Symmetry: D2
């Protein structure tokens, strides 16, 4: 069977299994979960660690006294289970004050508060051992054109991230930032909507090396993009610092279904890619047990996330190890794709008559790519109608 | 009225007004247009210049003799009308040989041919005065997961663009490259699917300064993204080298409707942005007169592209010049957005009790953003129910 | 200018201007509004009437005593302002008990309760003068495949609507039902996702004459469909009993922008259709003032809804009245469209050699449709760059 | 293993395996296939029959002499292989004459010709044994608002279908019509865009019993709708006369991938539904072997279509037969869903205090739906990590 263990690196945010089920058209269907209780239950399921927004662990507005009490109970559970906290993040979207954003809110005082609220949680994150600090600008964006001058908001966004970079370096912390893109929801359009936009923005920061991305399966799919393709680019750039796994059934509201659900073939290609590329970070599940579920359903959903990754991991491996597939990859020229186009150089290429003057485009065009046979072998492997 | 003149910088590709109407489910509805004839007619309409793919001007496979004949007739028309050729591009998608791509085709010999075919047209482009060379990788991508290893294809894509950069510099040409993103069609998923992905990729090239983007209205909208937002980021990065204007009615096949059609409010915000940011490049129309049209319809469609830009330009200007709007912008705090969040610095911000310890989130949250009044003033201006 | 008066038939639901701003990722940004106060403010704005879900007016679970108190205060305000209540609906989506639906919940006791809760509000609706009773099954549907057997769910949906038909007829009420379609959100997929699905379902009810549709601009656009076309099919079938007006910027979460926002050209084509078809029912606005707004913004947004309808109404009338457009419609053969294809009969059509044997498809194909010139005239009229 | 035999009812259209690969941006990648050869190769693969558009079999404009020759060769191949022709359709989209539609073209003579061309192929279809005649109005619709008055277009659509109904009945043919919906492409918006719209339209025809739908997997997904749910509504109405199977990767151009590709979980839920509902018609594959493929790839892709249906059929049966799943269905109350809500009647429901007055919504709300465990079982069965 497929039983997860801490070595598998499966992590969960407190807000995932802890989601009470409030949606835009309805009230909570489940009671609140004590963070300490979630930690112990996730440990029992084979999880590696947990993540949290400051506000999931400490109630907004809690006194320094209550704050210490909450952190103590959480640390107690971490200590008893040996659970890790690989990532932490700030909630800059729930309180009404962040209605127009945090780092790019038109109001300057709100932008200052947002940075302060973030810096306070970075200190806690480091104390708990987090190696990555995520930033999801859920409120950075707009519903109307003139409400937000995007060039100046990008100036404010760069300013905020640069200030965080200075803070972290001045303090000597060993923690990196990962930007989590999302195209829309709750704002009509959110700034840095996809992996590409986030990656481009990072290269304009003062210390680009401190920032990467934390893409989420469902978010890129909300723009109808290919997640494995985007992950490949992030990997090619050396910026996949963390990753959120879940499922999404197409272009609509952010569903956060458990991993495996939604686009199954995309899940398969994603796992094949992560494992083949040797990604070593956490396999974080940012999902929401549907509100139709009670607590037993919550834990079944969480268990399902990990199980599916394990089954997909086995199928991906079987796929790549099969000699019939290696033969099909050669037939489709995946090996030729790895050869430099012009290792001989520009001047040699220009003088090469076989590259143009004597090239026969019709003969070359006649060669079938053999992509369908390869894809069907992949399907067979996924459905276990073969390895 | 709104009569265009060469000063307005409106350009058209030969393939736009020249599109014969062949679509995936039907035959051509119009006869072919001689390039020379298009140039003269567009000049009569007030166009500034024209653009072309090598294959629009010279038939694929034409001998050196026929090639010179075709270029001569075209140059004659340019000379007689004073029309400019600001941009040129290569067709690496029509011939069957490019069925799996040009720069990233699995077959190495095809990749070499693709580079050679491109370099040949760069020479011609420069000769005709083009300042920008566009690259739309319509065939770079895949329909199935294993058919294309994306990390290695990005290696091949980087190799191709680097080789082009070396060519251009070795020759001393004063021409820049602009990558045109598209999410899908004709491939299931195309590499560098959006403005952001293209922008991120560029920063990994050997000479990033030589490359920018040529975004197209309809393409970003195919991913359901906000075009004006994406243009702002490209502008903030200093990479908007050229731009394709057209219309698209949502997430579906690439329609290439005339500019103005499709998302009208987005057209308004795009024009407001281009004009306010002071973009000085061509206003290129990459559109397709619907196949229901005869030649009179073709020219009416082309004229409509320019007219709409002119009307929108006037409304945008009226909008920004209105004192009631300037008042509404102040009410929405667009002025505060331009102020640095922490011009006083990190240390001052950390010691600032009004930024956190004494900040009142409820009072600040109570402040309405006044975004709806502003947006309605914008609507009034667009519909001319005011300036 | 464009001032609304009760004759314009603009209505608003209490939940529109009263939306407190709680979204899936954030707390309420505005305090609650007393139904009585909303009625008085909407009257001042020129609205014709209001609509309500039972739970907007009477708190869920309130005693018969408290219920009467709430109803009394509401009626006092209606009486003092002369405001009408043309439509009412039931909230079968907010309380956790409806997590799997009302009429199609798997649990039989919940389905029974849903019917009883509905019937109680139908009595109230009739008492207040409502002519249409709306049903939006926002919770009817599923997130996973086996959770719902759709054929049997449709049996339960038919049963519920048939029971309602029986009740209404037994009581002798003069009230009709209108189904409001929506493709998804809050459920992964919602049953009767579009206007077409609802129209088809209705013809399988016992008394089809009692039911119609209450389409919503933004809902059909969530499926990327053409709203005006859908409204035309509902008009053609004689089933447009009511309509919800708002705005949507593409395929994503239900935005409920004020009317005019989102797809502006669609809004124009819709107004053109409603006015030319002579739709006499309410122009109901089911929208939500963005949570970035305070109360002044709420009222500004609501006023905007009516203003935009009025401006669009003027431009559509101007467009249709223009002699140049009438000439353009004839050129595009809109008049030939109205002539029966075979008024002469099947037998005559079969014997007609000009319809096949002697028909020249190439000559006929040569005729341009002249659709672009016509659409540009439509654009000129919308932008007021003509009448 | 999973070998198909004629008993499986798999059929293919001549235009599927015969698609030459011409797409909007590229020339044909494969040479044409002789209909006779396709029939023989499909027979060897285990197909049950073939379908055709009139123009696939007989070249547009061919003389009566050439026509008979083409038909003769086709019939020879059918006779020799025992291959059936269950469905036939008319091509009313390729020739320029149909640029504005066939049945709803603005030009009256084109509408007449469209009907005559259809009637001629209906005679041929019946002669060859077809039981269903499909109609895909791919050209019925528009790119702009005033180009088509949708109410009158629907009048023309009804008129055409009614005329066809009259013809079929007058001739005493035993053939039924099936409308194939599609939301867009090649037209900006196509009339009767979804299954629901087509179902509703049918009930307004003179003889509704003669018409049903021929839904296509990829078409409904182009609107982001749930195909299995749509198929359930068509089954519930008794209108699933035929079905097109293929794959689609989201909202974008019509991909026509081989069945199994695209949304795999949907493909499983669809097979589960077709097999459990006892659909007895053809399993028709309307797909296109990617243009990257040569002829070996074409046949591999076609074989894949059937293989995937067979594997999915096995897993769906295994899922339903599993005792653990039957227990899970009972836990989720799928059985309660089948019990009438009010078998006791309206009057009894009204008098029932347990249905309202004494109902406890909080207790009932507390019951978990147990949908996640059930869906995970479904996943385990699909992946073969269980039966
Ligand atoms: Co999410
Ligand atoms: Co996430
Ligand atoms: Co385009
Ligand atoms: Co373009
Ligand atoms: Co809505
Ligand atoms: Co509504
Ligand atoms: Co198709
Ligand atoms: Co089909």
């Amino acid at each position: 069977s497929y039983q997860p263990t801490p070595e598998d690196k499966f992590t969960f945010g407190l807000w995932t299994v802890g989601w009470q089920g409030r949606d835009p058209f309805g009230d909570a269907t489940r009671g609140a979960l004590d963070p300490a209780e979630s930690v112990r239950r996730l440990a029992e399921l084979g999880a590696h660690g947990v993540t949290f927004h400051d506000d999931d662990l400490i109630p907004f507005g809690a006194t320094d006294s209550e704050r210490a009490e909450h952190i103590k109970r959480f640390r107690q559970g971490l200590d008893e289970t040996g659970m890790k906290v690989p990532m932490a993040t700030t909630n800059l979207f729930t309180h009404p004050v962040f209605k127009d954003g945090g780092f790019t809110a038109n109001d300057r005082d709100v932008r200052r508060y947002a940075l302060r609220k973030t810096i306070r949680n970075i200190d806690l994150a480091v104390e708990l051992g987090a190696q990555t600090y995520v930033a999801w600008g859920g409120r950075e964006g707009a519903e109307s054109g003139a409400a937000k001058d995007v060039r100046v908001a990008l100036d404010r966004m760069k300013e905020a991230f640069d200030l965080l970079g200075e803070y972290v370096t001045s303090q000597g912390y060993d923690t990196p930032f990962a930007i989590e893109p999302k195209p829309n929801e709750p704002r009509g359009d959110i700034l840095l909507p996809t992996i590409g936009h986030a990656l481009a923005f990072i290269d304009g920061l003062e210390r680009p090396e401190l920032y990467g991305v934390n893409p989420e399966v469902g978010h890129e799919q909300m723009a109808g993009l290919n997640f494995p393709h985007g992950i490949a680019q992030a990997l090619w750039a050396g910026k996949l610092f963390h990753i959120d796994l879940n499922g999404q059934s197409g272009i609509k509201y952010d569903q956060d279904l458990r991993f495996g659900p939604g686009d199954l073939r995309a899940a398969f290609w994603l796992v094949d890619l992560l494992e083949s590329a040797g990604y070593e970070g956490p396999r974080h599940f940012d999902f929401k047990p549907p509100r139709t579920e009670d607590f037993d359903g919550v834990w079944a959903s969480a268990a399902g996330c990990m199980r599916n990754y394990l089954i997909l991991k086995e199928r991906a491996a079987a796929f790549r190890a099969d000699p019939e597939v290696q033969e099909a990859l050669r037939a489709a020229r995946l090996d030729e794709l790895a050869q430099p186009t012009a290792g001989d150089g520009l001047q040699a290429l220009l003088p090469d008559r076989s590259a143009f003057e004597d090239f026969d485009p019709d003969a070359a065009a006649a060669r079938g790519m053999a992509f369908e046979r390869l894809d069907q072998l992949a399907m067979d492997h996924l459905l276990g109608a073969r390895g």
